[PDB]
Design a protein around this ligand. Structure first.
Ligand code: NA
Length: 330
């Protein structure tokens, strides 16, 4: 089997991407944030505290003839950005882009933190990191990909995120028309439950490539590119008037600037992030200070190849017995 779904930016900045997901029978379609940095499929629901719901579409298990309470199971998750959610668990039929899993754990939120409530466009998350991170207790649950894997034509999914445009998540096949050149594969460590890999270095603009190992995670659920402070300082030093602002919480730059590109290494290959991808716009409405898309990972404890990086590539998440990542230009 295969699945193919379009993923759409939630706003003009590509702050996140939503992908429609069919849950239950008859189908309830929710727009989920596919997150290769976590491993819980959780939704706004009929159980979510009413004051914590503001415009999201909810999953109502009592209206699904295939929903079953997973008795005793609870979940609770906290994300890198400080957001959180928790609740109880159903199993139900879940389909993405024509690919169907029966018996998927659908984590129904009883509580969500303010950032989720405030984002009317995201009805929940669909985690695509390794199932060892799933928070369900006392019986950990599998991701949608891990449940689909054995049925897929190839044990892979691909992320093809757009810049200010829709893109695609494919399950079970490589679309050879979706990228240029060849896919370069690179080793993955699953020891922290992430799609963790080692970039071979970087360049800033037309600058020389610096060969250096940068361990980090391929995380579709993180907006920005978070890299070591040395790398980030080297990038923003090339932008007149850029500075790290403790008050704003990262590097800002004059909105009048033209940003340089950023290149990262994948083995001997190179992925080029155009400068425009690194512009996250005014820090507040009407400000001439703009927020940078490349930020320090110092204090986060891991480097994160978030959407700013991934949307410059066609990315293969190879879930073979020994997982690997692939990157192609596009
Ligand atoms: Na922000």
């Amino acid at each position: 089997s295969t699945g193919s779904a379009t993923t759409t930016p939630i706003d003009s900045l590509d702050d996140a991407y939503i992908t429609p997901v069919q849950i239950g029978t008859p189908a309830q379609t929710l727009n989920l944030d596919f997150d290769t940095g976590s491993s819980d499929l959780w939704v706004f629901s009929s159980e979510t505290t009413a004051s914590e719901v503001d415009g999201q579409t909810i999953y109502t298990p009592s209206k699904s003839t295939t929903a079953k309470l997973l008795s005793g199971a609870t979940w609770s998750i906290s994300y890198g950005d400080g957001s959180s959610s928790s609740g109880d668990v159903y199993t139900d039929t879940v389909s993405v882009g024509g690919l169907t899993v029966t018996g998927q754990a659908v984590e129904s939120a009883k509580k969500v933190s303010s950032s989720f409530t405030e984002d009317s466009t995201i009805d929940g998350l669909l985690g695509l990191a390794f199932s060892t991170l799933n928070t369900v207790s006392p019986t950990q649950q599998k991701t949608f990909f891990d449940n689909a894997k054995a049925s897929l034509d190839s044990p892979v999914f691909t992320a093809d995120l757009g810049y200010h445009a829709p893109g695609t998540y494919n399950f079970g096949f490589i679309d050879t028309t979706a990228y240029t050149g060849s896919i370069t594969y690179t080793a993955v460590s699953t020891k922290q439950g992430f799609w963790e890999w080692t970039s071979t270095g970087y360049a800033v603009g037309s600058g020389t490539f610096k060969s250096t190992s940068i361990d980090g995670i391929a995380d579709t659920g993180t907006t920005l590119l978070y890299l070591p402070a040395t790398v980030v300082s080297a990038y923003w030093a090339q932008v007149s008037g850029a500075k790290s602002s403790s008050s704003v919480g990262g590097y800002v730059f004059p909105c009048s600037a033209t940003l340089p590109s950023f290149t990262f290494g994948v083995g001997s290959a190179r992925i080029v992030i155009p400068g425009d991808y690194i512009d996250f716009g005014p820090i507040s409405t009407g400000s001439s200070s703009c927020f940078g898309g490349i930020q320090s990972s110092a204090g986060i404890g891991i480097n994160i190849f978030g959407d700013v990086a991934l949307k410059a590539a066609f990315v293969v998440f190879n879930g073979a017995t020994t997982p690997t990542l692939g990157f192609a230009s596009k």
